[PDB]
Design a protein around this ligand. Structure first.
Ligand SMILES: Nc1ncnc2c1ncn2[C@@H]1O[C@H](COP(=O)(O)OP(=O)(O)O)[C@@H](O)[C@H]1O
Ligand SMILES: Nc1ncnc2c1ncn2[C@@H]1O[C@H](COP(=O)(O)OP(=O)(O)O)[C@@H](O)[C@H]1O
Ligand SMILES: Nc1ncnc2c1ncn2[C@@H]1O[C@H](COP(=O)(O)OP(=O)(O)O)[C@@H](O)[C@H]1O
Ligand code: BEF
Ligand code: BEF
Ligand SMILES: [K+]
Ligand SMILES: [K+]
Ligand SMILES: [K+]
Ligand SMILES: [Mg+2]
Ligand SMILES: [Mg+2]
Ligand SMILES: [Mg+2]
Lengths: 524, 524, 524
């Protein structure tokens, strides 16, 4: 359709106005004393949230040039959430500071591209300084402190996440889901579990719990559809001679074979339980192979050249206990030589490194947890649904931050680390005066998060900023207690990865937004 | 689409205006002297109701920020109705009081998060005090008093509900349905009944009542579809040799077998009645197994491995008397050893505890009632349809309240228990002054229900509040007769669960609404 | 529908206004100190771009006569992008200059058609002078300089492109795609690779990398669907006697033959791998023949009169190594007499010259690269997506300019070559005074690019134009460092083809736009 074209300063002031609208909505939620934003949903009740990316993803403006400004600055929060899972409000604050100072410098007659180059140079040096400034975060106390800070100063969340990470291991996974009570609870599963139950309730030998319990059984992994009992006769007779239970994990069992099995189980001839093979497609094949490796058996498949009639006891795995419920099957203490498990998890790590989508990566990580580590689930308790959503979002933030802090280390929080870095980079210069101005723009914008944190508390940002800049080390300001001290000693920790990611994404988007001259959009 | 964004006090005043609209509509119906609200329905005549959640679910406003406020406060009443079945007007009153005082405290420069923490601490202590303050409610007189109070001071409803609870027992169920006369009537069913009638009117041997009566029958429980009589000759021959009637509960009976049975019945050879198996799917299997357990028989099914031709007299259950009508079949005084019945009902209560949806839980409760207790039905009598609906809603409120009062106990009603609790918590303090202000906010808000009850009567709420606060024990105000006295002696009882749930949900939602700073919604 | 008709000067002023809107939007991005334009997209975030054709393709206006002017001048940028891949902003600037001067001359009472003839004569002479003025660009240093200049003064892009062209060769191809990191990387493939992997994971003999590696195998090129192994035995028996592996490239393999192959490979009988034939249809046939030519084998097809059962060792090709992954197949150091390779690539060049669409030509070039040269891929690294898109467009511009500079040579850049040409053509005259005025119009318009480049830097265009015109040789003005000097030694190079194309297309469209007298469009 027809277009509207704006040139120079008109375009820049419209763009800055849109940036300011979105940033002012987002920034009221930063720090221990930030507040909540109520978001109207077309289908349902409003959501009350303190998360930056959630607020940013809803903002759209009536004016089209201001809407372009807002849509451009939204990508910083989106990208920070995608990369680190936390630190989106800080990224937005930094982006707005850089855009404001850069537009001020441009209006004074500077070349925008040289300013952009200076900003890039300053941010590169800053990232190197941050990497030099970090310390490892390995003990459980520091992990508790990180989880507490990221969950808006909630000690119970930090303690629960530290316990979960200690119990599940370095190779395990932790998930968050809705609870049923009013208190948070942690349930950890050891061994392998897949969401497949028995195919016939008559298999139950322990009606007290409604569960099928087998001690030291055989596992027959059938990679095929079984409908006719004629195929299973040899293995069933062999196991009956053996005198110990059997478990069938197959693609499916039809009416005739299932009927024969249930008739035989209740007569006392054989103890047989049958469940479905988990997954659909290639992943189903992979997880059958994984169970074979864990249990020390061989998968019976037509695509390799073996028939189920010719199966012997050597193709059957073994375990110590098998417990089957209506929904989940667990295999406990299965026999398998370790080298096979380490080799399999090694291969899975290589296709982990060669994975693009996050869904595939998380499925592979869940497989590694099943084979080697554990799986923990945290249930969130709340009285209502809005409270449940808000608490669940906080818990997910804490979990992401603990992961990042483990994988890269921690720096002093509260905006102090960026101030220390900018103090260290005070003697950096570029090629021309515009580049030096851009370096100064970046270094000045590096103090915005602390100033906004102090504003949200109702204090004076510049007095606190001067007092913190006058100190050295981990000296900082505690906004929860309104006192100065050691950031590390009072437990205000930030992961290095979150700070670095926020700085990088903010600089990347703002440097481009500084260099605009014309804006082309549709008509009202 | 494009959005509208409001910051700070403007957002808070719009939100409070919406809260006030909804709360002022709901609160006029509180107490013995509350009034009715007329709700327009697009399809039909208007509904005249005195229930809080029914009024709350109807309100929607033109302005979008006020609509956000109303939509958020509606969840308190929704959740209270879902949890306790009663006490939603009290929850709405408490939520409005907390929101009003909290916004007043926020406008004075307090930190909303510390106020929220103080409110949480106060409510936790209050719930503990309420638990300490209750007394058991086990006799029939107290249950009658609770049912009377919850039905808007209607003696007959309380007496009827107490009689039903006495006749049916602890393990039975009671339902409410529309009547045909002008008087309430109670019909209680003893034994097991399912809604399946005879498959052929020719089976009727007693045309005076149009009913099929069999004495000491056999019950053949066939878990299969019978169409050819050839499968079934042996059991008919054996029963004919036995000389006493037979009952066939099967999936269905086709024309040929039904014709053979009906021909045989009218010649005096065998007394046979045929009915359909209740339910559809797995629940039908469970019901057939329940009848087998009650009657001491064996279900004939192909999936476990017996054929109906090989059935003997041991697979047939026994009873004392069977009466079949056009719609219902009843089995009275079945012959079966008790231990099977207790085992089955225990099993069922274990999968009751592991049930998520209320529909599944109430189906299992129906099954337990059929196996062990009884089923009662209360028909409501009224001249018109609007009166019928209003009375039926009152009766449902009364029945829910009696259940809650049995399961947790009673406290003194009229808003007196909350006043006693707030008097007890007068020395509670937090960590900083903001939290102390929040504690005071919660304690002040606990007096709102009594004040609104007195205001609905046309009296002075503050004079009555002062007089009641000056007393001790169960001293309170009777708003029906405008007299002070002992709450327990005059029979104004409230379940503990209703009070506790109202307090918890109101606090949970209001604490979050206090901490708002920005609102984002669509443009007009 | 109904039309609007405008005559003469009214039409011309509306047309010039539209031309000016489009040109003024496009021209802000010209030179080393041009800026970016933000383009709104209906689906997605805005795009920030510095490319002339991208900006031009977006402009549409409200007035229909101005819209006709804009839509007419848009074809210059479109055609320059189609022809050379670069120089669209320069073409637009030249077109606007010619149109403005020509309309001024027409308003003075000149014949438009003689002006058009004079403009054509001047442009023909200018193209001849440009061809005489060039020097070859063959060394890698000049290639790096061209790539650097065309990428907006980015040294790394030029160095990477020079390395890629050095490693791949004259007959190879280079492609640009999105990266994953923050740094640019170059990956070059030697030999032939096609993008189908193995047909069964059981073929993998090296689980460490998940790759199938075969040493000196045979290649059986079957242009047939293999489903029954009966057709296939003799060649497997022959190669089992031979004792060295085999590779099957076929249209596809069904379950039976694949099962036989996999069950044989794992038993140590024969080492067999099966992959799909690349392409769909005739191109599949052509690249199958190409693999036959490279590996020294014969394609087994029914359309020529041979059957796969009668195949012998002569029909099987040979190689040195074969590496198959999940996605790509790699054939390294295949045995084949060179004369066949040169014959095949020469033939492919003959149908290259006889190709119309660009898609067919680029597919042909890919096949030439696979048979003779190499294939390189450049991944672009950036922190966000807008930055990635902007950098990727810059890299593509650089790659196109480097190709053009290879194929035609370089001239002095910065607008200096056009000034030298126009200085040389100062004595050119036509047939009548109108044609002389047209020649002068073209010569004056030839100085517009330098003036706009100097204007975008904040300097005075006329002072710099006079100073550069007063010089000789490659003497020019460096707008990056604001210094005068020699273009060649400071490395500001432009391809001859880009300059010539811009001049030709701009003159072609502007000359026709000059001769307008009436405009007919729809009604508002
Ligand atoms: N008690 C405290 N004193 C000072 N700074 C704090 C305190 N608690 C948290 N912070 C800082 O506030 C920031 C938390 O902001 P947050 O709302 O989590 O936004 P983001 O999405 O950027 O993480 C962190 O950078 C943290 O260092
Ligand atoms: N005679 C009475 N005197 C004082 N209070 C009463 C009397 N009867 C009922 N109430 C109180 O009125 C409240 C009932 O209000 P109601 O309209 O049922 O609202 P809700 O939905 O909260 O139950 C109860 O808290 C009860 O204690
Ligand atoms: N440092 C420089 N000094 C002077 N002229 C330059 C310099 N760098 C590039 N140029 C000139 O600027 C022009 C580049 O404009 P550009 O934005 O690439 O538009 P186009 O799409 O027409 O190539 C080229 O003609 C080049 O000769
Ligand atoms: F309004 Be409540 F349900 F008594
Ligand atoms: F804008 Be052109 F493609 F350099
Ligand atoms: K936040
Ligand atoms: K009410
Ligand atoms: K350009
Ligand atoms: Mg955070
Ligand atoms: Mg009630
Ligand atoms: Mg270019």
């Amino acid at each position: 359709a027809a277009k509207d074209v704006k040139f120079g300063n008109d375009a820049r002031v419209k763009m800055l106005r849109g940036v300011n609208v979105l940033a002012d909505a987002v920034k009221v939620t930063l720090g221990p004393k930030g507040r909540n934003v109520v978001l109207d949903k077309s289908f349902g009740a409003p959501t009350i949230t303190k998360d930056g990316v959630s607020v940013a993803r809803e903002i759209e403006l009536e004016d089209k040039f201001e809407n372009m400004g807002a849509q451009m600055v939204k990508e910083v929060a989106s990208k920070a959430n995608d990369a680190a899972g936390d630190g989106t409000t800080t990224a937005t604050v930094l982006a707005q500071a850089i855009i404001t100072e850069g537009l001020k410098a441009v209006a004074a007659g500077m070349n925008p591209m040289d300013l952009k180059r200076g900003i890039d140079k300053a941010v590169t040096a800053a990232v190197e300084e941050l990497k030099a400034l970090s310390v490892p975060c390995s003990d459980s106390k520091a992990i508790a402190q990180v989880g507490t800070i990221s969950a808006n100063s909630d000690e119970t969340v930090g303690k629960l996440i530290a316990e979960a990470m200690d119990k599940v291991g370095k190779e395990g996974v932790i998930t968050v889901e809705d609870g049923t009570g009013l208190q948070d609870e942690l349930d950890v599963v050891e061994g392998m579990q897949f969401d497949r139950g028995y195919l016939s309730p008559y298999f139950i030998n322990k009606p007290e719990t409604g569960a099928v319990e087998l001690e030291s059984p055989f596992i027959l992994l059938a990679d095929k559809k079984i409908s006719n009992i004629r195929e299973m006769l040899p293995v069933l007779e062999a196991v009956a001679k053996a005198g110990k239970p059997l478990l069938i994990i197959a693609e499916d069992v039809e009416g005739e074979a299932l009927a024969t099995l249930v008739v035989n189980t209740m007569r006392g001839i054989v103890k047989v339980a049958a469940v479905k093979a988990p997954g659909f497609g290639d992943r189903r094949k992979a997880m059958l192979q994984d169970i074979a490796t864990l249990t020390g058996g061989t998968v019976i498949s037509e695509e390799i050249g073996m028939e189920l009639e010719k199966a012997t006891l050597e193709d059957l795995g073994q375990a110590k206990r098998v417990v089957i419920n209506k929904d989940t099957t667990t295999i406990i203490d299965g026999v398998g030589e370790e080298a096979a498990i380490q080799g399999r998890v090694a291969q899975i790590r290589q296709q982990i490194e060669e994975a693009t989508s996050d869904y595939d990566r998380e499925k592979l990580q869940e497989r590694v947890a099943k084979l080697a580590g554990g799986v923990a689930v945290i249930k969130v308790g709340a009285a209502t649904e809005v409270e449940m959503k808000e608490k669940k979002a906080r818990v997910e933030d804490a979990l992401h931050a603990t992961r990042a802090a483990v994988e890269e280390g921690v720096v002093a929080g509260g905006g102090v680390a960026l101030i220390r870095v900018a103090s260290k980079l005070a003697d950096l210069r570029g090629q021309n005066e515009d580049q030096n101005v851009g370096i100064k723009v970046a270094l000045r914008a590096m103090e915005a998060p602390l100033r906004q944190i102090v504003l949200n508390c109702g204090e004076e940002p510049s007095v606190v900023a001067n007092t913190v800049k006058g100190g050295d080390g981990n000296y900082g300001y505690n906004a929860a207690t309104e006192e100065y001290g050691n950031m590390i000693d009072m437990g205000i920790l930030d992961p290095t990865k979150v700070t670095r990611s926020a700085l990088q994404y903010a600089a990347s988007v703002a440097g481009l937004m500084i260099t605009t001259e014309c804006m082309v959009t549709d008509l009202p």
